[PDB]
A paper describes a structure:
[name]/Bop1 is a eukaryotic protein that was firstly described as an evolutionary conserved factor involved in large ribosomal subunit biogenesis in yeast and mammals respectively. Its function is essential in the processing of rRNA precursors that give rise to the mature 5.8S and 25/28S particles. [name] directly interacts with Nop7 and Ytm1 proteins (Pes1 and Wdr12 in mammals, respectively) forming Nop7 sub-complex (called PeBoW in mammals) that co-purifies with pre60S particles but remains stable even after its dissociation from pre-ribosomes. The C-terminal region of [name] was predicted to contain seven WD repeats that form a β-propeller domain of unclear function.
Here we present the structure of the β-propeller domain of [name] at 1.6Å resolution that was obtained during crystallization trials of [name]/Nop7 dimer. The solved structure of the C-terminal domain of [name] has confirmed that it folds into a seven-bladed β-propeller as previously predicted. Structure analysis led us to slightly extend exact boundaries of the domain (residues 427–807) towards the N-term, when compared to the sequence-based prediction (residues 435–807) because the strand D (outermost) of blade 7 (most C-terminal) is actually formed by residues 427–433 which participate in the “velcro-like” closure of the domain. Electron density map allowed us to trace and build model for residues 515–534 and 571–594, being the rest of the insertion unmodeled. Helix H2 (residues Tyr520-Asp532) appears between strands 2C and 2E and is attached to the base of the propeller. We observe that in this case there is a different interaction network, conserved in [name]/Bop1 family but not in other WD repeat-containing proteins, that involves strand 2D from blade 1 and a short α-helix, H3, from blade 2 (Gln580-Lys585). The third area corresponds to the long 6C-7D loop which forms an important extension and introduces Asp757, Met758 and Met759 into a cavity formed between Phe635, Tyr665 and Gln670 from blades 3 and 4. Indeed, as seen for the electrostatic surface analysis, the tool found a big region of basic residues on the surface that included five blades and the entrance to the central channel on the top face of the propeller. Taken together, our observations demonstrate that the C-terminal domain of [name] is likely to form part of a protein complex and is capable of binding RNA unspecifically through a defined surface.
Residue numbers in the entry: 416 to 534, 571 to 807
Amino acid sequence: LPSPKDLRPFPIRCSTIYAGHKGKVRTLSIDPSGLWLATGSDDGTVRVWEILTGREVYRTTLIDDEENPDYHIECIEWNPDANNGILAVAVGENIHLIVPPIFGYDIENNGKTKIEDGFQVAQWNKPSQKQLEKDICITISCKKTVKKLSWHRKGDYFVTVQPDSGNTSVLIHQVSKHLTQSPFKKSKGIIMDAKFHPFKPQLFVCSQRYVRIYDLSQQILVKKLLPGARWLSKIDIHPRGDNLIASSFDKRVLWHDLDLASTPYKTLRYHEKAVRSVNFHKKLPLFSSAADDGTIHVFHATVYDDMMKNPMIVPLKKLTGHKVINSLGVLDAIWHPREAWLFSAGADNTARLWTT
């Protein structure tokens, strides 16, 4: 197998600290243009940052009582479609769609008109005056806490996870119609993650124990993965669509080759503590795991689409720098869409940029 030296580029150092949050950074997202990092924190704010300088350029306070242990900013993600300025934010039992005033008319109006056009498991509400001042354009109110949100590639649909909400633990929302639907009749376990396939009409649903793949067109289950863990935390799907990685609180990362077998192709043990995030690069043959030990591990993976060879996975680099706070370390991470750059969110109140 090739040495890391033969597998550059990959990140090896922290060049930039995004400093300002006054509480744990639970979630972060990079915008479609690859220039703007958004972060969500227990200090009750969402912030947007100029990625190469670390300069904070925007802040909105979504929770005025940030000391409240009952609800927090849980998950944020920029809409993936270019030039609409939309940021989705799950906080408590609500999803806000926010368009920050940092892009100008052509982009901001595109987002706002998209969200306004659409004008019972979930309710879609016009913002109050207080919410307008926070740059909220619409709010989707669910019955239970929303822990995870993920956009479909085309930027109209998004899926959310409400753990222990039974039949409505997984909801699919459609911005253009202000429509929320529960795709499933049956609740199978506590749901940890839900993600659309990169190009197939499929939804991947991660429970604590399994990953189930549904064909939304055929309306049927097509595969059930058996990772062999009791406490799955997150999944990501390889950009060419035939492989998956899964993190677990029991310190493992599982690679599943979806066509090869339902059990893990490879089990990676590179963390001393619970693994909170796994993330594929969208273009480069890289992925990462991030854990409560405060470390990020970076891997190479070559996938052989056509020929009878299984994936080649090579560890590249251990990234250290985040501080462990109350047994928590790196809470989230996301790759730049094009560069070998990784962004991480820390329990230590920082986000960080890791570069070559």
